[PDB]
Design a protein around this ligand. Sequence first.
Ligand SMILES: N[C@@H](CCC(=O)N[C@@H](CS)C(=O)NCC(=O)O)C(=O)O
Ligand SMILES: N[C@@H](CCC(=O)N[C@@H](CS)C(=O)NCC(=O)O)C(=O)O
Ligand SMILES: C[S@@](=O)CCCN=C=S
Lengths: 210, 208
Amino acid sequence: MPPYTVVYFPVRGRCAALRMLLADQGQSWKEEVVTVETWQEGSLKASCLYGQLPKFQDGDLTLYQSNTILRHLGRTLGLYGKDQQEAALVDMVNDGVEDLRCKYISLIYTNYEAGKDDYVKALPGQLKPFETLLSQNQGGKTFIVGDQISFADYNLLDLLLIHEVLAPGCLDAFPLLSAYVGRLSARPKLKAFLASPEYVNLPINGNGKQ
Amino acid sequence: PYTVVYFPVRGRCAALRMLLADQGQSWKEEVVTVETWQEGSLKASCLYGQLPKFQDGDLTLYQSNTILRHLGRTLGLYGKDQQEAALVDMVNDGVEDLRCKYISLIYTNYEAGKDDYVKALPGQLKPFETLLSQNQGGKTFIVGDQISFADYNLLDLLLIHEVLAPGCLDAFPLLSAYVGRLSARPKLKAFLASPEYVNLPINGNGKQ
Ligand SMILES: N[C@@H](CCC(=O)N[C@@H](CS)C(=O)NCC(=O)O)C(=O)O
Ligand SMILES: N[C@@H](CCC(=O)N[C@@H](CS)C(=O)NCC(=O)O)C(=O)O
Ligand SMILES: C[S@@](=O)CCCN=C=S
């Protein structure tokens, strides 16, 4: 049996990046799907540390928090920079990704209709820091930090992919981010995963908005 | 070695300052005033247009939790092994989640949202009491047997919530004793009593 288990709703959401990471690294894992019906029964929810999913099992280590899972896999799979300075830069990118993800999450679930045009208005200014980071690392031709992929690459890639669905062509203003999405998405195992039914047939979010 | 660049408030620098002080580190405070932020020069120079900004030698970092993790990594406050490191992250991400709710209350909805916030507070604090309960009966730190950057961040979270809702730890004996215990560590005690902590407001809008 695989040593990893992902416990989540039937959505991409906050597990998309860690699943991309696991698939691209050739690691096996198990998906435990929680219907909202099961969630409303209340017992699993009360058993979660912070009352929420994802829940992740690595053997008998039980983790909550999507970014905790990403950092854990980053540590154990060697996707956390080459040294301590790179690890801090990886964190700096991931915190920035999370900051924009929460804005996206707030739009999707609490204010899609009245807020979308304001959000897409502000989107170039929120993407530009990642373009800048790329431009300062080997001309943007490798990864977001350093010479090797990190968990922040998978999280950033997901963030960019869902924003292209929200605002098609939003990366036309950002040549390095655009080429970066194409480059990472062409990694053989990741390309196969992104094309696979276990990815394609899940909605991005839980309310049918994207 | 270190420079902290921030507004003259405790805010998202309070925990990393407590860490630095308790660990006997020295640092320089570059205080950015609101008049100075309004110009726009520094702001446009910051990676995400925001403070804090942190300098460690020729390394420049943004994001409060990046700074905490970097100090945890380089000072040995990040658990004894990868398993503990993951638990430290899980605590810190939970602290950040509640801090985000607190910040949203303080800055966007204090007057109308305060009662609902305080009513929901016990269920937001109980996870940290449960975590203490599962680690040596709550007698040491939030993870493992040694202090971590998450301890400083959790301590700050608890301290500002006691100002927001006095008595909010009274039902939680492990959290209560933990706050007293960490707060009595000599260097931290001295920092928490010092003017550079006491005479800063918690937040930038006079609400607390
Ligand atoms: N900070 C958490 C957020 C987790 C979260 O918001 N989970 C949502 C779905 S992605 C959830 O469980 N909602 C159900 C509920 O809160 O009752 C993480 O990064 O994992
Ligand atoms: N995710 C960032 C958020 C930092 C943040 O919210 N900074 C605020 C003050 S606490 C700020 O710089 N506001 C002024 C501005 O955005 O121009 C962190 O954790 O450091
Ligand atoms: C505004 S909550 O209903 C958002 C749920 C999905 N994720 C996260 S964080």
